[PDB]
Structure 1
Amino acid sequence: GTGSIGGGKGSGVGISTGGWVGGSHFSDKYVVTKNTRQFITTIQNGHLYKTEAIETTNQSGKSQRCVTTPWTYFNFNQYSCHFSPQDWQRLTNEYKRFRPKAMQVKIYNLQIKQILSNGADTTYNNDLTAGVHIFCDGEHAYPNASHPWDEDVMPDLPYKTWKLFQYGYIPIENELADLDGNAAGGNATEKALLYQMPFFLLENSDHQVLRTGESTEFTFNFDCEWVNNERAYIPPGLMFNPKVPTRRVQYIRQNGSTAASTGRIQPYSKPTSWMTGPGLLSAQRVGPQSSDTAPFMVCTNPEGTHINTGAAGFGSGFDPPSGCLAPTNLEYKLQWYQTPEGTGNNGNIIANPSLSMLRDQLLYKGNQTTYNLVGDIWMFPNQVWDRFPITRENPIWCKKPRADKHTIMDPFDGSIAMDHPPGTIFIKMAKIPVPTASNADSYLNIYCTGQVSCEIVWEVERYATKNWRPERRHTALGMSLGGESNYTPTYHVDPTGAYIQPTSYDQCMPVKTNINKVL
């Protein structure tokens, strides 16, 4: 049902630079997702680079220093971006693993409008000679624009308008520069940090400038590890045959009155060579919602401790701490809101056990009498665990920090650590100077709308099982009713046009809950 486009192959105002793409194609080895959004970008910071310091004192809740830029950026990092709930269901039901392979982004059909405000009404007219600056940072030569679990992501519904967020970054750890700080300290390393605090201008590189008849296109080739969709039906410790005897001997030392005994290990409990995976349960969250509450605080202090007992502005919180361990409290569970309007207990989704036996692991230390839970299990030889089951609402990737030494990279939120994730596309409108009598900068008030199309080829692979029995699958019967009068199902739309969100973790259709693997 594709029409033949008429009109010449030329270019300019009155010729569109691309069409709308949408929908997925499933195959055995590949899944192709196509998504187009209409985006809107506006002037940021009045075309200025600014810095901001909180100066802590708990007013904001810690000490941050940020530089905000005139730029905005595209954030594609999330699965709901690329998959409809239908397509995500099909992916997690029909395939044991998948990874992104190739990516193609087009920015096209650009429209710059001048904003004319007279009194109480505002008008919008084309300025056809206005440009927009666009470039991708693929070298990661600038601070990353996006961080996992941000609300800046592409809209889930294809017909919603995507408003870009302002780009900004933290030039320095602000608590490490207290300025005067303490008087008898004679601050030096604090000034030394400020003198070498970097400053980044996107204007320091080459940009493409697009007028309304131009378009631009970016391609990216993923070299990626697979995200696996498989469930362990047993722990690795149960891989034995309980009827078979073992050669192994268990010596039990003298316990109180009970004499030291030796004997053959029972057939139904055989020793395992495989250990609980890493995780930290010992810490608890601190302080009011306003501060940084994470149970572990990862700080870098070059000088003399004194983290002000509340972590001050030193460091960032490490959450979730528990890793693959069974969370012993709600604090340790990954939790988010479906909507930027979510608050409190409304609109929040708590991650639930996937019922995979490589997750929710625990370690118990025997004394002579009993077993006690080991709070902090560190990285140890012979640990095996599965990754956090990712839903359609999880971030896809995180960027690996550039560093000399790193341990196993398995972010506990479930995002894939990548050496070179897709580059961020930065976009701002050309500053249009307005002639002014004084030296105060005045500009023309303009905004740009356009279409972005993302197209990802997913390398995918199906499952084969010798299991006799029907496996668990994701089904619409696990959905719930919502909206006004509560007659609208989960991924449907409200009578007001509101898109009903999943209220539970299973409605988000996590991976590793369905297809069984033999250990």
Structure 2
Amino acid sequence: GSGVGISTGGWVGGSHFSDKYVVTKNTRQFITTIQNGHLYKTEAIETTNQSGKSQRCVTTPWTYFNFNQYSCHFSPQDWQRLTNEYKRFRPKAMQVKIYNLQIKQILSNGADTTYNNDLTAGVHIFCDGEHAYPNASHPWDEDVMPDLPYKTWKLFQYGYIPIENELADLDGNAAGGNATEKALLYQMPFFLLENSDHQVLRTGESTEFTFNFDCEWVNNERAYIPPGLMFNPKVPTRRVQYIRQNGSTAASTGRIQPYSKPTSWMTGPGLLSAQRVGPQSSDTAPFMVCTNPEGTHINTGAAGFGSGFDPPSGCLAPTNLEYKLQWYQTPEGTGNNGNIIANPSLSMLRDQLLYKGNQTTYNLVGDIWMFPNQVWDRFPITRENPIWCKKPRADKHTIMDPFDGSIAMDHPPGTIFIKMAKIPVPTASNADSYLNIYCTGQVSCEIVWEVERYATKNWRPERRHTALGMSLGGESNYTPTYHVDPTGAYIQPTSYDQCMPVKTNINKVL
């Protein structure tokens, strides 16, 4: 049957490894609340205002489900077994279910608050698979599904940036009159999630969404030598190296030495020239990707308009800590506390350099662009990396490697939006008061991962991700990584290697 008192679905979880496939099931307990008091609002996002960096977003009542990260779908055991036993993997299919909803009313008299289940209140649930609305998810957000299946998942409000602010700044001047600047405002899109059709669910009801990926593989195999050493040092070469006269030393023609042969392959692109700017408040990235159409007025300049492009060095060796990719394990993390810095995976298609020689010596080429015969490996993703990124809709685009490592998909998984159906309340005024409710429920993401097992003719052992690669933590510091403190706290990895990255273990003949 169906109704109040009949659970809609059960709990699923775990993982089933096969040769061709890996099916990782997860279920979480989520809570969403009334956002903005059921209003759309466009307000300026202001920093400390030491610099003129500002932002403008339109905040909706809606909240959304973000499934994008590996930490959500794989346990540390499932990840270790994934990266040790398989050379490559990608997400075949994804299935999300939202069930066992409970909408409860919040009754607050004074300090103490009580919770009464109304049973007739619904929730709006909307999945955008055509990407007609602006994307909610962005890589490296803290909104993502929790790692531990028993933690509650608190959803985040949905908002989006209608316009670039400094372009719309209205600052202008008396001479220009900012006509082209108003023109940007006049066409500033405004999206309501109410335009589209969507489901309204009460406690007895549930819903389901399926997604089918088609995307590129994530390669777990390591390069033991650079592509430049793909030769045989015993065999002589036919080539000639002519060196022009340098100072006193005369020009010399001679056969290239057998041990160093010319490479036909060049360094993967990346930019080492730029450096970060300014205080932590302003956007600090070394490069700023910005748009400045003629006629508009920008008073602040620099990073005020534009968004920073980081990490700038895609394949290149991160000479400085600024270039190394870095994040925090926990939202409580402050500076140097709980931060993880990317380290070399010791893959020779990764952390490349390029030296421009003059007559006397070699010097580092700061920034190298796309050039033919460039081969490189994508960032060695860990378990904490985002799975996908949304590729913009644009006429032309170059090769897609996001330097964070995420996969650029032009149709990533749809973003599932959910909110409290507004329950109005009678009021003699215009005060448009509403009833205070929230909904908790059980969401289950189940993804089918397409894996393919390695095979090698290598004689020797290879590196593997081992639990011996972990450190103790917690109070009294006897709890390992990925384990629970006596207080109940979950011990986060303190190093990039405890995150078990790919492109480390398995060797691949170049």
Q: TM-score, normalised by structure 1?
A: 0.97
CA contact (8 A) 2:383 2:501 kept: yes
CA deviations over 1:199-223 (Å, ceiling 9, x no partner): 0000000010000000000001111
CA–CA distance in structure 2, aligned partners of residues 473 and 57 of structure 1: 46
Give the drift of 1:181: 2.4
CA–CA distance in structure 1, aligned partners of residues 301 and 322 of structure 2: 18
CA deviations over 1:327-366 (Å, ceiling 9, x no partner): 1100000000000000010000000000000001000000
Give the drift of 1:120: 1.4
SS in 2 for 1:312: coil
CA–CA distance in structure 2, aligned partners of residues 57 and 174 of structure 1: 16
CA deviations over 1:395-443 (Å, ceiling 9, x no partner): 0000110000000000000000001100000000100000001011100
CA deviations over 1:248-296 (Å, ceiling 9, x no partner): 0000000010100000000000001000000000000000111100000
CA spacing shift, 1:55–1:24, aligned 2, 3 Å? closer
CA–CA distance in structure 1, aligned partners of residues 6 and 320 of structure 2: 58
CA spacing shift, 1:112–1:317, aligned 2, 3 Å? same
CA–CA distance in structure 2, aligned partners of residues 452 and 330 of structure 1: 39
SS in 1 for 2:149: coil
How many residue pairs align between the two structures?
Answer: 510
CA spacing shift, 1:462–1:307, aligned 2, 3 Å? farther
CA–CA distance in structure 1, aligned partners of residues 165 and 388 of structure 2: 27
State the match for 2:140 in structure 1. Answer: 149
CA spacing shift, 1:309–1:211, aligned 2, 3 Å? closer
Give the drift of 1:484: 0.5
CA–CA distance in structure 2, aligned partners of residues 58 and 276 of structure 1: 41
Give the drift of 1:368: 0.1
CA–CA distance in structure 2, aligned partners of residues 104 and 459 of structure 1: 15
Identity of aligned residues (%): 100
Residue 169 (structure 1) aligned to one of 154, 160, 168: 160
SS in 2 for 1:191: helix
CA spacing shift, 1:500–1:281, aligned 2, 3 Å? same
CA spacing shift, 1:180–1:374, aligned 2, 3 Å? closer
CA contact (8 A) 1:108 1:452 kept: yes
CA contact (8 A) 2:32 2:154 kept: yes
CA spacing shift, 1:317–1:449, aligned 2, 3 Å? same
CA contact (8 A) 1:54 1:60 kept: no
Q: Structure 1 stretches (4+) deviating beyond 3 angstroms? A: 54-57, 304-310
CA–CA distance in structure 1, aligned partners of residues 171 and 290 of structure 2: 21
CA spacing shift, 1:403–1:258, aligned 2, 3 Å? same
CA–CA distance in structure 2, aligned partners of residues 452 and 32 of structure 1: 17
CA deviations over 1:127-156 (Å, ceiling 9, x no partner): 100000001000000000111000000000
State the match for 1:3 in structure 2. Answer: none
Matches within 5 A, 1:223-262: 223-262=214-253
CA deviations over 1:352-395 (Å, ceiling 9, x no partner): 00000000100000000000000010000000000000000000
SS in 2 for 1:148: coil
CA contact (8 A) 1:173 1:313 kept: no
SS in 2 for 1:506: helix
Gaps of at least 5 residues in structure 1 are 1-9
SS in 1 for 2:389: strand
CA spacing shift, 1:371–1:308, aligned 2, 3 Å? farther
Give the drift of 1:177: 1.2
CA contact (8 A) 2:167 2:298 kept: no
Give the drift of 1:18: 0.2
Give the drift of 1:309: 6.5
Residue 97 (structure 1) aligned to one of 52, 71, 88: 88
CA spacing shift, 1:12–1:55, aligned 2, 3 Å? closer
CA spacing shift, 1:434–1:457, aligned 2, 3 Å? same
CA spacing shift, 1:323–1:213, aligned 2, 3 Å? same
Give the drift of 1:62: 1.1
CA contact (8 A) 1:61 1:292 kept: no
Give the drift of 1:55: 6.8
CA deviations over 1:46-68 (Å, ceiling 9, x no partner): 10001112477825861211100
CA contact (8 A) 1:72 1:166 kept: yes
CA–CA distance in structure 2, aligned partners of residues 333 and 175 of structure 1: 30
Give the drift of 1:312: 4.4
CA–CA distance in structure 2, aligned partners of residues 476 and 275 of structure 1: 37
CA contact (8 A) 2:172 2:296 kept: no
CA deviations over 1:64-95 (Å, ceiling 9, x no partner): 11100000000000000100000000000000
CA spacing shift, 1:76–1:399, aligned 2, 3 Å? same
CA contact (8 A) 1:64 1:313 kept: no
Q: TM-score, normalised by structure 2?
A: 0.99
Give the drift of 1:183: 2.0
CA contact (8 A) 2:221 2:505 kept: yes
CA–CA distance in structure 2, aligned partners of residues 495 and 317 of structure 1: 41
CA contact (8 A) 1:390 1:511 kept: yes
CA spacing shift, 1:433–1:89, aligned 2, 3 Å? same
CA contact (8 A) 1:39 1:163 kept: yes
1:186 and 2:196 correspond:
no
CA contact (8 A) 1:16 1:109 kept: yes
CA spacing shift, 1:114–1:291, aligned 2, 3 Å? same
CA–CA distance in structure 2, aligned partners of residues 58 and 451 of structure 1: 41
State the match for 1:6 in structure 2. Answer: none
CA contact (8 A) 1:89 1:509 kept: yes
Moved more, 300-309 or 435-444: 300-309
CA spacing shift, 1:51–1:59, aligned 2, 3 Å? farther
The Cα RMSD (Å) is: 1.2
CA–CA distance in structure 2, aligned partners of residues 477 and 372 of structure 1: 40
CA spacing shift, 1:184–1:57, aligned 2, 3 Å? farther
SS in 1 for 2:166: helix
